[PDB]
């Protein structure tokens, strides 16, 4: 039957597959996608979370980072009461609903734990806090914390790891102000797009993009983003699993912050999986 089934898919035109693609998703969701890499035992011999803590990572340089507001982009694609065209000032009811669509496939008790930590119990009803809050839920669960897991486990097994947080808003940015620095809007700068005289970027942003291209190029040459010898500026320190140091890529010089949403990812990477396999 398997060979029979695939042959039929191979006769169907390509646009009909695309049409019915979002339907196979199990349960309504956001930041979920139907066809992804499968843990088959060929390309991925085990789950990535397994492979990450008993892998061969000594001798490896890794550069990792997040943007300031990772969640925002995804909320207009399924969270109740969000658009780019209004302020997305959601109700508590809409917040509760969006937790179950931002964090799908999870028990009722687990979703209560999410609401426990990302609610502001002095201001449970404030729409602006509720908005940013749900943005952090989706941001933390999907990007910030899986990255922060990788960085520490890589570092602990002998990778030279450097960590950044990108927190500058393109003056050209077309999305509303409440989306902050959305998912994807460091790329323009890493790739030197400000240098294009077509685009309407700041003179000061052009300096910024040249400074980022330098960091990415130093890394590619030397495994270390830092300006070699050159000590004019703050030094960008490698991320360790203990001190957990990262820098802020901003129009200001490197600020060396410490701890990469520590309290949040304790919940996301450690406590929530316990609670799931216990209920």
């Amino acid at each position: 039957n398997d060979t029979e089934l695939v042959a039929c898919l191979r006769t169907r035109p390509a646009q009909v597959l695309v049409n019915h693609e979002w339907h196979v998703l199990p349960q309504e969701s956001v930041f979920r996608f139907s066809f992804v890499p499968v843990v088959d035992g060929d390309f991925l011999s085990d789950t990535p979370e397994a492979l990450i803590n008993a892998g061969d990572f000594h001798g490896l340089q890794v550069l990792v980072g997040v943007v300031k507001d990772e969640g925002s982009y995804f909320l207009v694609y399924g969270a109740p009461g969000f658009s780019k065209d209004n302020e997305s000032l959601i109700s508590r009811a809409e917040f509760l609903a969006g937790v179950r669509v931002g964090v799908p496939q999870v028990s009722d008790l687990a979703a209560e734990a999410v609401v426990l930590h990302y609610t502001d119990w002095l201001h449970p009803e404030d729409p602006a806090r509720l908005r940013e809050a749900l943005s952090d839920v989706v941001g933390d669960h999907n990007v910030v914390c899986p990255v922060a897991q990788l960085a520490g486990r890589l570092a602990a097994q002998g990778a030279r790891v450097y960590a950044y947080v990108f927190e500058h808003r393109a003056s050209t940015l077309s999305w509303p102000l409440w989306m902050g620095v959305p998912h994807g809007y460091e790329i323009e700068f890493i790739f030197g797009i400000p240098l294009d005289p077509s685009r309407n970027y700041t003179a000061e942003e052009k300096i910024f993009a040249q400074r980022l291209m330098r960091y990415w190029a130093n890394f590619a040459r030397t495994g270390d983003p830092n300006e070699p010898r050159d000590p004019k500026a703050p030094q960008w320190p490698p991320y360790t699993a203990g001190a957990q140091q990262y820098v802020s890529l901003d129009l200001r010089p490197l600020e060396v912050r410490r701890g990469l949403r520590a309290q949040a990812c304790a919940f996301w990477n450690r406590f929530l999986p316990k609670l799931l396999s216990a209920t």
Binding site: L25, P37, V38, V143, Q149, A220
Partner: protein, 254 residues
């Protein structure tokens, strides 16, 4: 100017010179790195491109892999900047090489870009991913690739020789093998390749750190806002059947 005719293992190429405020770079766009994955080759792992007589026109981007197209905010720049900017086709396994205009006389590290967009979309030809400025300002070789997305690169019936799954990831791997064989033709050092990627592309980079057969094809990795372990980048073999057989049923198959 003569630095625009280059010969890779599969045959001759004809590139195009590109303009930067700082000065030129020279670029080879739409190099065929796989035999086109279609008809019976839909859902199958990629085969290496059989070699060609003549000169391949590598002056424009090649097609964009078949994918969903965002219609949420029609015309909106922020929406549209990620939407495909070439014809859709399953005939899409092509890669691109930027190199500094006076070709580096000594080996120079290679940056390889894997694009993002949740494994259901993306293309190497988006304007945000343009490599002229990176290659002009820092003089490294840049390579980007196109890989199969959505069901075309990730529908899996785990166990079947017909839909093995991860064929979109094998597409990326075939491109890395191509970098190992031919990047020296452009002044690049096969012994100093750095993967970089965003969103699903960062997830992909990570997955190459964890698949042994891709570990000889690069040496450094940068992961931008993504990771292979996250809750969205993988599914189990049983969910992949559930999701692949449902598509078949929504389309009339059996």
């Amino acid at each position: 100017d003569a630095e625009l005719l280059v010969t890779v293992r599969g045959g001759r190429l004809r590139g195009i010179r590109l303009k930067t405020p700082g000065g030129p770079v020279s670029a080879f766009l739409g190099i065929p790195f796989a035999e086109p994955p279609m008809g019976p080759r839909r859902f199958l792992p990629p085969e290496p491109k059989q070699p060609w007589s003549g000169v391949v026109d590598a002056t424009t981007f090649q097609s964009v892999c078949y994918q969903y197209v965002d219609t949420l905010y029609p015309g909106f720049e922020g929406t549209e900047m990620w939407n495909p900017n070439r014809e859709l086709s399953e005939d899409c396994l092509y890669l691109n090489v930027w190199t500094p205009y006076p070709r580096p006389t000594s080996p120079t590290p290679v940056l390889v870009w894997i694009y993002g967009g949740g494994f259901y979309s993306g293309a190497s030809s988006l304007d945000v991913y343009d490599g002229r400025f990176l290659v002009q300002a820092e003089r490294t070789v840049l390579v980007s690739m196109n890989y199969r997305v959505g069901a075309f690169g990730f529908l899996a019936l785990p166990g079947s020789r017909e839909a093995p799954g991860n064929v979109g990831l094998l597409d990326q791997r075939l491109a890395l093998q191509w970098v190992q064989e031919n990047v020296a033709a452009f002044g690049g050092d096969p012994t100093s390749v750095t993967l970089f990627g965003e969103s699903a592309g960062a997830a992909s980079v990570g997955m190459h750190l964890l698949s042994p057969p891709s570990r000889g094809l690069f040496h450094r990795a940068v992961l931008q806002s993504g990771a292979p372990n996250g809750p969205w980048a993988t599914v189990g073999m049983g969910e992949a059947r559930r999701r692949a057989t449902q598509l078949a049923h929504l389309v009339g198959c059996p």
